Every structure is written in C-alpha cells, then in structure tokens.
Amino acid sequence: SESHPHIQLLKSNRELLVTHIRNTQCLVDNLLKNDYFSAEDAEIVCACPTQPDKVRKILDLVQSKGEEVSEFFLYLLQQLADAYVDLRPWLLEIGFS
Structure with missing residues (x-):
C-alpha cells in the first residue's frame, strides 16, 4: 500500500x-503456528550466530512480510510481555536471584 x-x-x-x-523461540514458534513464518524463515533465524542477531533477523523478516505480520508481531510482544x-x-521475594 502506502501507509505502514x-x-x-x-x-x-x-x-x-x-x-x-x-x-526468540516463543516468537518464532508463534510466527510459525500462525503461518506467518515458513520452515525456511525459521531456519534462516537459527543460522544467526547470536541472539541479538536472531532478533535483528526476525525483525527484518517481519517487516518485509508486511503490515499484517508486523501488526501481529506487535500484539504478540504485548501478549508475551503480559504472560x-x-x-x-514473587520470584524476587522468594529470593530467587
């Protein structure tokens, strides 16, 4: 389109x-289960040497897939952040590091 x-x-x-x-794994698994990422896409992310590189790769892929997938991804981060x-x-109080 023209607006993104x-x-x-x-x-x-x-x-x-x-x-x-x-x-990164919950993200990739969700993108796969929702048919926004293919086996090859996941494979491409796995091939990244570091986690920060995997996040950059996932963002590149998501952005190129489009507005629908980028919107999905943002709502996915929101839901995961609330998860x-x-x-x-609690984890802090129980002296769990």
Missing part, C-alpha cells in the same frame, strides 16, 4: 527491540 504504521514502529525502535527482547510479568514480584 506497524512496520515503521518496528523500524524506528530496532535497537531498543534487539536489546530488550531476550527470548509472565506478574510473577516478577
């Missing part, structure tokens, strides 16, 4: 995303 807010949001926050995302956040207080 979700794609742009990811592009502008690249470094912030690469340093704040510390888990375990409420255990932080």
